[PDB]
Amino acid sequence: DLNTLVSELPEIYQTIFGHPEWDGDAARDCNQRLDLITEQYDNLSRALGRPLNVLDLGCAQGFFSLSLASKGATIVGIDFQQENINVCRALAEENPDFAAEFRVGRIEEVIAALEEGEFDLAIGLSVFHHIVHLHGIDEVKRLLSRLADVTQAVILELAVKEEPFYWGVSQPDDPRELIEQCAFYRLIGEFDTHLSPVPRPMYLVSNHRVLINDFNQPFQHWQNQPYRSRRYFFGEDYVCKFFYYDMPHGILTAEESQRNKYELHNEIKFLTQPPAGFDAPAVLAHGENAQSGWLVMEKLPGRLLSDMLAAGEEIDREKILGSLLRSLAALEKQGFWHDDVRPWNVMVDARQHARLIDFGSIVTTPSWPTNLVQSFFVFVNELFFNLPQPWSNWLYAVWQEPVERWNFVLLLALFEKKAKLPSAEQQRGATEQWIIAQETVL
Amino acid sequence: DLNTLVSELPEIYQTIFGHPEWDGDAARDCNQRLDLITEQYDNLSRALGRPLNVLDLGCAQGFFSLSLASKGATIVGIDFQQENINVCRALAEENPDFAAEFRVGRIEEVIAALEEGEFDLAIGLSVFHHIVHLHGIDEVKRLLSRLADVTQAVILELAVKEEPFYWGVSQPDDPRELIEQCAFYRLIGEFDTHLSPVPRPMYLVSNHRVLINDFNQPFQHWQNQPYRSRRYFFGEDYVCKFFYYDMPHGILTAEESQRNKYELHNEIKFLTQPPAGFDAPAVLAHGENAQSGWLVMEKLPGRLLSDMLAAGEEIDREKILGSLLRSLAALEKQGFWHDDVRPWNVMVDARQHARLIDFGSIVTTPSWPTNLVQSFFVFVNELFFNLPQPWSNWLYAVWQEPVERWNFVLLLALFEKKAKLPSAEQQRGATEQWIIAQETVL
Amino acid sequence: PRELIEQCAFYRLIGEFDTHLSPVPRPMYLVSNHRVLINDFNQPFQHWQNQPYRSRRYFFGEDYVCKFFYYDMPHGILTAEESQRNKYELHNEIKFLTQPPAGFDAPAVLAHGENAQSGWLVMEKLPGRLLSDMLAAGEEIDREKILGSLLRSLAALEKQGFWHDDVRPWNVMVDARQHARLIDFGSIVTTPSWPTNLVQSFFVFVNELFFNLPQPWSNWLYAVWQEPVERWNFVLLLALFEKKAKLPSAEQQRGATEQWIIAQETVL
Numbered sequence A, B: 001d002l003n004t005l006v007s008e009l010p011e012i013y014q015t016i017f018g019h020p021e022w023d024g025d026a027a028r029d030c031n032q033r034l035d036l037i038t039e040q041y042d043n044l045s046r047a048l049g050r051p052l053n054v055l056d057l058g059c060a061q062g063f064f065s066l067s068l069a070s071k072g073a074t075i076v077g078i079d080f081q082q083e084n085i086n087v088c089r090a091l092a093e094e095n096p097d098f099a100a101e102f103r104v105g106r107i108e109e110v111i112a113a114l115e116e117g118e119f120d121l122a123i124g125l126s127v128f129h130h131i132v133h134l135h136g137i138d139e140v141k142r143l144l145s146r147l148a149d150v151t152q153a154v155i156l157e158l159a160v161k162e163e164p165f166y167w168g169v170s171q172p173d174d175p176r177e178l179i180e181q182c183a184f185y186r187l188i189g190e191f192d193t194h195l196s197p198v199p200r201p202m203y204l205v206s207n208h209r210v211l212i213n214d215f216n217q218p219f220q221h222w223q224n225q226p227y228r229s230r231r232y233f234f235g236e237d238y239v240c241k242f243f244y245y246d247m248p249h250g251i252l253t254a255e256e257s258q259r260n261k262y263e264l265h266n267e268i269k270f271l272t273q274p275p276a277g278f279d280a281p282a283v284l285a286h287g288e289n290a291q292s293g294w295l296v297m298e299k300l301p302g303r304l305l306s307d308m309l310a311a312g313e314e315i316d317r318e319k320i321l322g323s324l325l326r327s328l329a330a331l332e333k334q335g336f337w338h339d340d341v342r343p344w345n346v347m348v349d350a351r352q353h354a355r356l357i358d359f360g361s362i363v364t365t366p367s368w369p370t371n372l373v374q375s376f377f378v379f380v381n382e383l384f385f386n387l388p389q390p391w392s393n394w395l396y397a398v399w400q401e402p403v404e405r406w407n408f409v410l411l412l413a414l415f416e417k418k419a420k421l422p423s424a425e426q427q428r429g430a431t432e433q434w435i436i437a438q439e440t441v442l
Numbered sequence C: 001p002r003e004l005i006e007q008c009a010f011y012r013l014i015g016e017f018d019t020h021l022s023p024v025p026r027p028m029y030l031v032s033n034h035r036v037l038i039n040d041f042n043q044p045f046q047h048w049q050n051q052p053y054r055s056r057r058y059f060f061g062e063d064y065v066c067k068f069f070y071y072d073m074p075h076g077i078l079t080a081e082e083s084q085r086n087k088y089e090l091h092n093e094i095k096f097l098t099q100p101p102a103g104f105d106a107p108a109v110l111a112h113g114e115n116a117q118s119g120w121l122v123m124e125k126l127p128g129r130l131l132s133d134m135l136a137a138g139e140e141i142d143r144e145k146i147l148g149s150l151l152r153s154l155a156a157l158e159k160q161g162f163w164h165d166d167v168r169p170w171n172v173m174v175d176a177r178q179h180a181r182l183i184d185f186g187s188i189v190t191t192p193s194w195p196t197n198l199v200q201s202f203f204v205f206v207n208e209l210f211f212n213l214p215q216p217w218s219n220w221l222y223a224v225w226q227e228p229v230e231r232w233n234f235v236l237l238l239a240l241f242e243k244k245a246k247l248p249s250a251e252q253q254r255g256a257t258e259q260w261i262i263a264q265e266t267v268l
Ligand SMILES: C[S@@+](CC[C@H](N)C(=O)[O-])C[C@H]1O[C@@H](n2cnc3c(N)ncnc32)[C@H](O)[C@@H]1O
Pocket: A013, A014, A057, A058, A059, A060, A061, A078, A079, A080, A081, A084, A105, A106, A107, A108, A124, A125, A126, A127, A130, A131
């Protein structure tokens, strides 16, 4: 009888599915986590076009497993306590059309035995801290990496060191240390455990998909360090830029988080409303919240200029500078400037034409834009002290201009006629050269 | 003043008896435990015919002690904190007609000093885990055995390892390990501690009485292993069979608990409504709940057959088999059969007449009852390969019968005429002998 | 060294090399979690299995199953006899399937090979579930159709001079229409009194598929037991099975032993 099986549970951790007579006894009601988990189930099931295979690690009394099997999922639940599995099975038998199997076993061994594709979704709620406590953080990171490797999505509720108990001392400084080796992760909620006032964060993690409520797609590769608070995911015709505002440990000062926030916000604003006369990459999706923000754009051909420079690839500096200057002059005509023109913000296509790819540093108002013209000289010099004729003549001509006349329209016009300009080396000069050379060091 | 004494309490653990101004401050309200404890007090006081002497171990602020003294109990409360005892005494003085004494002291030393008969009831609520933590499980088991030895009843609320605190690690795997050496125990409730979502079980324990709400009687001996989930208590004219459905540790699989449940349930059903033509032992009391079930029956004279066989006692196999077969044939005539006729289910009285004593295996419907007739041959053989004439002739005659004719009426009729039946050894036979001999091995 | 890799799905020893540090060579392994990588057959698989129903592994791809037997295993794992039996069964299975008897639909063979360490066989993938799984997972089964279909194929084998030494639930696959077929031919044999022992085990099979026999299955078995033993064979077993509804009622006879001998066998 169920009555007996429930009584022999060492703990009624969860609601007993279908049996509200024990709801008052359950340590956690599970309705809040279930609301969120079912939402994520539906998103992923919608994206894949079918009911999911779900793995429930440390499934306890089966509540999540049964609740998802109720919605048509095929589920396997694992727990190392016989009493828990006995209850799960008895509950499944009350619901014979549910495709639900349960097994006694250890999560460590199950994870090792998993095969990719066997399960679409795995859930591991409030169980990994037990594995951390016995086996350490590094083994748990590797288990979670494998779990992510073999599924499409993982949902974790993770206990945290701020919980007032003795086992908190063995926890990592931040729960994200268990998952940050995985490609994609997002905080999706925080839950009351009824053990203390400290809530546990729930994360959605994937090694194969961008999983954003509005955009759910496989990616084939990703990158953290461009050219660690920013991640880029590459899919067939998209790039997803994912910025963390909230990072663990020291990592971001207050100012840096706000700048991450500012840049991504500014980039969204610009790309959703780009200026006429400028071909901006197209925007497929975007959103922001307290922890992070994201932007999905059309994927552009070409390579990042800084990579090409580093990997000594052959470049046409004339075509790169011409194309870039043309776009900067067109921005300026619409009252837009870019505050940070550097090789890692520039992409060069197969025909050696260049374009900006980060619009975080775009600005709309201001003497000005004189400083930006100055840096652009450094850019130029780093792209190559190092300027042959007629690039040196171009820079010399600009320096002879009254400063109120420095702007990108002028920079472009002089660039286009640089072959006609007088020879700098024939003049006393000589300072423009030395100031930028010191700038280009500085 | 009471105000000062209460303030100097390191903790207001309990309601301050008579002083509801501190009820909001009390860690535990105590009303739920008190409701249950008073019920048990009344049962035992009713059974003994008088007010009880009660011992309250780790009595804290005296709530249980005073509440029972209010109902006419004579109480002694023990606690090792002076501040707690000061409050208890001040409260007792506000209630001068209560027969209540309080002493500072250690439970370990008090238990050692107890004399049998001094107290009828001892209560030890949420205190033994402190003794486990400092002295270990084995010393605590011995203290609890002595406590049970010297009282009529013990009520314990026991902390458990699932509680989230550091001291949980020192607790036994299951709280029943502290008490299972005692003769009689029953779970009577589970209580919220307000420290966590994990409740503490309350047990009623005795080394001298069966304490079931409907049946409250001394017993003079008891037994676990017949001939450990089943216990038998023997009193003057009764035997109480007590089956645990819920057992600690691995001990019972789900199927085994259900079979314990099934057998005891089936036995109750049969004995409360026995078939005409069959003398069944009489039923004095019975009940079942999630954890266990019990049945109190009239006590039958005689010895269990398997004991007599083991202790090589002299037996009359003719009279045993005759009497048993007669009762089996009468059952069968009423549409009843017994699925498990074995020596440990048979009792033999002084005149060598035998009867069944376990009706867990009784069944009412089904080719059949051919299998049961087959086992009965094994029974027969074990009661003695080993069959002399005319027992061998009896079995041979049965084997020559078409199988649709095998039943206990036939078995009995052939048994009664076995001296007239043809000699098996004069026939080719020979197989019935070898099949049962292999069965009787198997 | 295999302890570092045996958790991976597919592995094969491909050579052994002199290190010039000592006379002890180092093995080179080819390992994959995604493909069967056999020189003749190189294909993705989508799942794999070790324990059927650990020296044998099965890889499942879109229209194939690859059976991979280790003859050479680490540690204690295989005695000499067991390795040779792995070798024998896989060899025997290859021989049978590459040259199957007329009158028997055998799964088709896509690739195969053997060497010192292991042997492999890639076959067409058959629909259905393994009978022992269905029994374990209490799935609904039609014992009439399973036994009928299986007996028909066994009788046809026998007519071609072939028998199967090990008819058990884990060697039988049942399709959606409840028709059954053998899927392991390691235990096929060609010569021998006989095939009387095999007929006997088939009764156990029958009983485990359900002591436990209702009419007319019990009548069928009783009829077989009344036959002189030189007449026991699968053609007879099949013929009596097809007419079992007409056969006399066993419970009306003294019997009774055939029942008890198989019940003890079915324990044993
Ligand atoms: C704190 S409970 C969480 C239960 C459930 N996941 C939930 O949050 O509602 C941890 C569960 O995981 C199980 N567990 C802990 N370690 C395990 C392991 N190594 N393998 C399988 N189950 C494990 C326990 O038996 C227990 O049921």
